[PDB]
RNA sequence: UUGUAUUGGAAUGAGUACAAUGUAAAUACCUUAACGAGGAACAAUUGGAGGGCAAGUCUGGUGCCAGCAGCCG
RNA sequence: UGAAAUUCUUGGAUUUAUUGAAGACUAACUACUGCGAAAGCAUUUGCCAAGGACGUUUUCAUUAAUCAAGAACGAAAGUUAG
RNA sequence: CCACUCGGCACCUUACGAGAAAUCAAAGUCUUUGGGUUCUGGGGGGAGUAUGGUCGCAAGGCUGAAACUUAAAGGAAUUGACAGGGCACCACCAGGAGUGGAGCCUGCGGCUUAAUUUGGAAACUCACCAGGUCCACACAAUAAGAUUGACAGAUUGAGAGCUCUUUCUUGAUUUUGUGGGUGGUGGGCCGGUUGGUGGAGUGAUUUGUCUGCUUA
RNA sequence: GGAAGGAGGGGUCCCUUAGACGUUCUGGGCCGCACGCGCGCUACACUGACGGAGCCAGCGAGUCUAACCUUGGCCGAGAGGUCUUGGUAAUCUUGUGAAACUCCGUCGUGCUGGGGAUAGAGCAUUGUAAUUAUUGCUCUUCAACGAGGAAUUCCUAGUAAGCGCAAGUCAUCAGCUUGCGUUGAUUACGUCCCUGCCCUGUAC
RNA sequence: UUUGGACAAACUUGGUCAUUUAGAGGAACUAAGGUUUCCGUAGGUGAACCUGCGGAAGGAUCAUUAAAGA
């Protein structure tokens, strides 16, 4: 693949010239080995996958599409350069939650914005009905929130969108914010109501918080303190 | 009176040769009896046809390779 | 200083006043002005020797032009000794 | 202060002239080529390098190559590609109705299949799948009977006087082997923009097409 | 001031030929579905559902070539059937007596009398043929859905939105496309913030 | 055969310079980012890129300034 890596490498080169395909890149064969394999937006896709096909065994099926990346154990590819930037921010920023505690899908590569990450088993919280343990569920979606608080994040959308079925784990983290952002009380109440309409309207529920617990559900001044500034490793929002 | 293709008599030395001439003796030249043209097979080559620089938008092949190219190509 | 730190200071820094010492430099006036073979030369006064231009009814009478060899001077930096 | 004159640092005007041009009182009086005299260059690199000499306390100065390599390196002057200001509900602002979440209809991709053709379908349409019938020219043999048409009935998963039981009608319109294929065969016609004459320049360029004020 | 200080008209010489880039019949498929993307229809109810009564349009299209659009009488719970009739059409169907809408009652906030998918039994109509089921009617079955995250579409006046009708295709078959009328708002009358387009130093 | 003399080929042993050749043995040795632009001199960094002193343009000039009858 030397022949299309470098005639990748040449070109932060710079239009381009013909001479440049002459003299920028390195001879006989070369000058036709580069046509045998040329021969059979675009190009820096269908192409540019090379990276990936060297350097990590199955091409798997379609999966998913979507406005701003597309998805086909699972591969994540987005959509002419801002496109490796967004990759490495998400890459970065999902491998770090990994590393503690949180229940994200474990990263495993990252080259040439494509990603490679874990393939989840569940299905969406969505049109969950009948699940065997609904209290202790409550607790500990309540509890995921605090986490987040403490370590200097606030999800933008923790809803049921985005979970999959504690058996539960959270799959995209959209737009986040740093808990020192101007606004972080009231996108925080957000995320408490919305789990609480969910609980109340479908399930029908209504240390640990709910029934069994001595606080009812927690609250944006009560078990935040600051215990890790992640928001510092990836500077999310609000410095 | 000028071109393009079926047909007919004429002319001649390349070569061979009796002789004489030539020469110290010879060979050859000059002269000459006999012989010696119909794909007149008694068959002219050496370099070129992008430009410099006279002369092909012809037809088949080949694969930046084999090659061409004083220089530009 | 873009922002700041090292630094100096209640035994008084920075700022104010009256005096003193040392070494260097010569503002404004200063220009489409001057002088010198070039490098280069700017406060006052004195001494020393030189120079161009001008004026000339003075003197000599071709004594001249350019120039290998050879010779004097030659910013700034740099070398040796006080 | 006015007039004149010699010498000097400069300026403005002028071009018989000069030059590739920018420009030039000399960079003029040169193919109409000769006033006197000193020094230096001969395409670009290697290289102000190596070596010898000479000067200097030293740093260094002066003099100064070749092998080899390359098709350009260089001068002057023309034209001109890839911030502002304007416009639009396929842009926003103020808002309305929403879509995205549920069930169902429908289009595309993917999957499956013998096929799910290609990119207002129950037959036909139809282009797809399974299984059935039926159908040139040029040489050698053949015929007054080469061949053509037709009642009633019949054969398969799919059938008919182009096949068959029975047997009439008709006449050279032609039949069976063997030799290259030629063609109702593939790959002739449509759907904001410039010059003339004049001016400048050796030219490529330029003016006209403008300093200022107006419009889509 | 004033009806109005407008709206629209790049494409079409070579090779190959016996049943050869064929003819025709029966049956099947194009409708299969773990899923992804997109245009839509119907709803989540009281500004409503159901029952009775009131009662109003505009643009189309229709047979002798034969059987199109159908009034009126009779039968049937209904879908539908049957005997006649007008029109080659400003004349007849047709005042297309359309729907939303208005008035008087039942229901009472309970996935309820909201919503009607999936499914069982039976009766008809088109067609040569309805099985994997064209369409219509009757009784029974009674699912999700409690106003919808990130994203994202159209729109400045008889306009958006609500409601229905006619034509196209067409033996039958629409939740589709185009047109027409009925009821009829809120919010600007601006800007270059976002998206996008256009115009006016240097040999590069 | 022999004395002396002039002419004078050439020989031997040291020194020195140059060259041919066998030939070690080794070193080899080679191949396969700046942003005014510069000159001389001195110092610094692995490294263009840095610093001191003197010099050049071969670098893009807007605006304003004196006026005469006893």
Same mark, same amino acid.
């Given at each position: 693949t030397d022949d299309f890596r470098v005639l990748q490498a040449v070109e932060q080169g710079s239009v381009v010239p013909t001479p440049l395909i002459h003299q920028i890149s390195g001879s006989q064969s070369g000058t036709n080995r580069a046509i045998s394999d040329l021969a059979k937006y675009n190009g820096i896709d269908y192409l540019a996958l090379k990276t990936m096909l060297n350097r990590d065994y199955s091409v798997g099926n379609t999966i998913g599409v979507g406005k701003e990346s597309d998805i086909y154990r699972v591969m994540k590819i987005h959509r002419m350069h801002l496109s490796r930037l967004a990759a490495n921010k998400e890459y970065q920023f999902m491998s770090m939650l990994y590393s /503690?505690?949180?229940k994200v899908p474990e990263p495993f590569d990252n080259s040439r914005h494509i990603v490679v990450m874990e393939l989840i088993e569940g299905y969406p919280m969505?049109?969950?009905?009948?699940? /065997?343990?609904?209290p202790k569920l409550y607790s500990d979606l309540m509890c995921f929130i605090v986490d987040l608080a403490n370590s200097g994040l606030i999800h933008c959308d923790f809803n049921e969108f985005n979970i999959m079925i504690c058996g539960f784990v959270v799959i995209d983290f959209p737009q986040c914010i740093s808990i020192?952002?101007?606004?972080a009380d009231y996108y925080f109440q957000r995320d408490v109501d919305c789990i609480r309409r969910f609980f109340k309207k479908k399930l029908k529920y209504e240390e640990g918080?709910?029934?069994?617990? /001595?606080?009812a559900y927690p609250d944006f001044?009560?078990?935040?303190?600051?215990?890790?500034?992640?928001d510092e490793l990836v500077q999310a929002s609000g410095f």
């Open positions: /503690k505690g949180f969505r049109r969950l009905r009948k699940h /065997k343990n609904i020192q952002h101007q606004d918080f709910g029934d069994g617990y /001595k606080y001044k009560r078990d935040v303190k600051r215990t890790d500034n992640l």
